Amino acid sequence: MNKILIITHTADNFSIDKVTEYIDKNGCEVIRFNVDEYPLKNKLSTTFQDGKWTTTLETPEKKNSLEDISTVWYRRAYNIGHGIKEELDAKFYGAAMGEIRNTLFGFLESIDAYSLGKPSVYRRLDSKEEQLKIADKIGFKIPATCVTNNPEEAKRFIVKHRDVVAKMQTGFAIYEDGVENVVFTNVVNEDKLEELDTLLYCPMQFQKKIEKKKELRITVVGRDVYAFEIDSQQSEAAKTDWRKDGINLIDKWIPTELPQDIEFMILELLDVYHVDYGAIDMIVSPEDEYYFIEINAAGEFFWLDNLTEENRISKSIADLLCDKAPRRDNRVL
Amino acid sequence: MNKILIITHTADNFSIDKVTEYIDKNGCEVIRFNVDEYPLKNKLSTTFQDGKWTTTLETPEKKNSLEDISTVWYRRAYNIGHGIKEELDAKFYGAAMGEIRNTLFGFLESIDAYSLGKPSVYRRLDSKEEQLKIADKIGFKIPATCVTNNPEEAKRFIVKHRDVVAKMQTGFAIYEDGVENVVFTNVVNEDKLEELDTLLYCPMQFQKKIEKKKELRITVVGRDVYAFEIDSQQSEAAKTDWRKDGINLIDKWIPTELPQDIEFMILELLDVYHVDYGAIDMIVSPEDEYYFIEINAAGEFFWLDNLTEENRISKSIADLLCDKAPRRDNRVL
Amino acid sequence: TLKYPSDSDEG
Amino acid sequence: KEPFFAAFLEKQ
Amino acid sequence: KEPFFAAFLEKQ
Ligand SMILES: Nc1ncnc2c1ncn2[C@@H]1O[C@H](COP(=O)(O)OP(=O)(O)O)[C@@H](O)[C@H]1O
Ligand SMILES: Nc1ncnc2c1ncn2[C@@H]1O[C@H](COP(=O)(O)OP(=O)(O)O)[C@@H](O)[C@H]1O
């Protein structure tokens, strides 16, 4: 009876499958709004008539009304308006896509039922600087960081910390010389130090390189914490032991358990943001100190959910969406 | 003395000169951040090292420390990255602009001091649907509304509501013959209900045409409320959209006083959104009914501010930024 | 759409 | 093809 | 010209 709106795209049908199964068992209905099919293949309408609001969604599969949904789960959209480019003249394309995106994001904002994801929240989480500042305030250890377009500032930072990686806040890729080239986080060496003057045209995020003893991915669904680790140290050690030949669990994340202080601070980070989903990246140095790297509000979880027993993260998300788990209530009034 | 960071652009002195003058008269320093010149003509650096955060905005004449500011005013962010297109090779331009925008707006979001405007907040208030829903919940009278890409839903709305105007949620200029054409609010020709075919390719917002006895613009600064009125129905061009004759009507605005219930509801709107600035557009119909039309989270105020005596709205903004007026405190931890 | 009152923050 | 609002275009 | 991140392009 209880209806749960889920925003996805057509290519993602796999991680949502187990969540939908567990919601079905929980006794709620799932309404799938595939976002790439808007506005071409779906039709959405919100109306205010005679003092009443009504929102209806027409799909190739079903026709539903949405003004009475119990919750919404907005998985961040990256491709809306598929096919509009071929249908509309060039002079109208930018404005039409702007209006489409604004109408849809505005509907998603207007939902006053409990929301797991919203456009303004995702936009707030795009600020990696605020992530680092908040994590430092909570008590997380974070790497030395310099976000800058100042060549002299970056050079001073690099000569000070002596082992610096450089990353963009938004990636880049290009097909050239017969092959795809992607930008990766890499150390600033003597060769790249020559091109530091070009920083004037676009900033970069420099960070002290944390030596990896462990790498951690932490998926948080409400107050459910799932930690996974890659033990680089023990992997490299096993590569010397002949008894470990052919056993390459070294490249696979294994479930692990966090120190209770780290988990407390993770839950506090989600409390400060007032969101019920998070994907946190951490690095454990050789000195066994935990470094926060970033939190992704839209991070994928299926690859690690398949490493749990019968998709525990999907069950967590389903219980959260059906109001069968403690929530950070974000209903609008 | 306290430092007030003002996010603006080089073509925006017209709205910030008086605010800067009154801030200086209040005893606080103004740090102007022109974002056209980022990152070409000024340098922005944020560093965390040795447990300390620093932020430096370096212009060719002055280095400003931003980590100890007491307030930021997100006023305008026009033409970020101006001049980069002529510096960078074309293959890097879009990605470099994405990175520049992410860095700038992420610094803006990461300011934990009191903020009059932030990216996440402005983008939440981009949702006109949530605006109308929250206004209806507060008690405002709003026009009958249908936002959709579904032609038959629009047809039903247009036949049930006979006098209906069409509206875009976003602003956009389309270039034809080097001419900039735009889409005002236009009444929907009730025979022209063919050609709503087009509605599938891009949605639109239809509303019951409200007859305009007068039109109101209400600028709210904290708890200060400056209401102005205009008679729109004396220009056949400005009769459906006063902005269509705006430059002629720009000095015909008259100060007005709202009924106390309308003012209480406007203050309650700003309380619900938890912002200290707003530009609310309303329409008073011949039957003396006050209709909420829109709230602009970053609307213009200078042309009404110049109709007061000695720029009262700029003075109120300066007092709010210098913490001499009650705030809806939004500091982060 | 119009920006005679240009109330948008972006541009 | 044109979108709907194209019918309401006019020079500013 | 080229931005700084262009110096971090790698194969695949
Ligand atoms: N301060 C740091 N010190 C050392 N390594 C880091 C630091 N920050 C990020 N990294 C590493 O850089 C990598 C960035 O990943 P990226 O280049 O996006 O590839 P992927 O697509 O695998 O994330 C991460 O694997 C992370 O472990
Ligand atoms: N329902 C309506 N009935 C009559 N006129 C309207 C209606 N909605 C908007 N208008 C007119 O169109 C103008 C712009 O409306 P709106 O789209 O709300 O503002 P903007 O386009 O600046 O965001 C208003 O100044 C108003 O005069």
What can you tell me about this protein's structure?
- The complex is a heteropentamer, with 2 copies of chain A (333 residues), 1 copy of chain C (11 residues) and 2 copies of chain D (12 residues).
- With 333 residues, chain A is α+β, with helices and mostly antiparallel strands.
- Chain A has 3 domains: 2-117, 3-Layer(aba) Sandwich (Rossmann fold), CATH 3.40.50; 144-208, Dna Ligase, domain 1, CATH 3.30.1490.20; 211-321, ATP-grasp fold, B domain (D-amino Acid Aminotransferase, Chain A, domain 1, 2-Layer Sandwich), CATH 3.30.470.
- Chain A has 10 helices and 18 strands.
- Chain A is globular.
- Chain C has no helices and no strands.
- The termini of chain C are far apart.
- Chain D is mainly beta.
- Helices cover 0% and strands 25% of the residues of chain D.
- Chain D is elongated.
- Chains in contact: A-B, A-D, A-E, B-C, B-D, B-E.
- Chains A and B meet through β3, β4, α3, α4 and α5 of A and β3, β4, α2, α3 and α4 of B.
- β3 of chain A pairs antiparallel with β8 (145-148) of chain B, so a sheet runs across the interface.
- One adenosine-5'-diphosphate binds at residues 143, 165, 184-185, 207-210, 215, 283, 293 of chain A.
Question: What's this model, at a glance?
Answer:
The complex is a heteropentamer, with 2 copies of chain A (333 residues), 1 copy of chain C (11 residues) and 2 copies of chain D (12 residues). Chain C has 11 residues and is mostly loops.
Q: Key terms for this structure?
A:
heteropentamer; A: about 325 residues; alpha+beta; Rossmann fold; D-amino Acid Aminotransferase, Chain A, domain 1; 3 domains; 4-stranded parallel beta sheet; D: about 10 residues; binds adenosine-5'-diphosphate
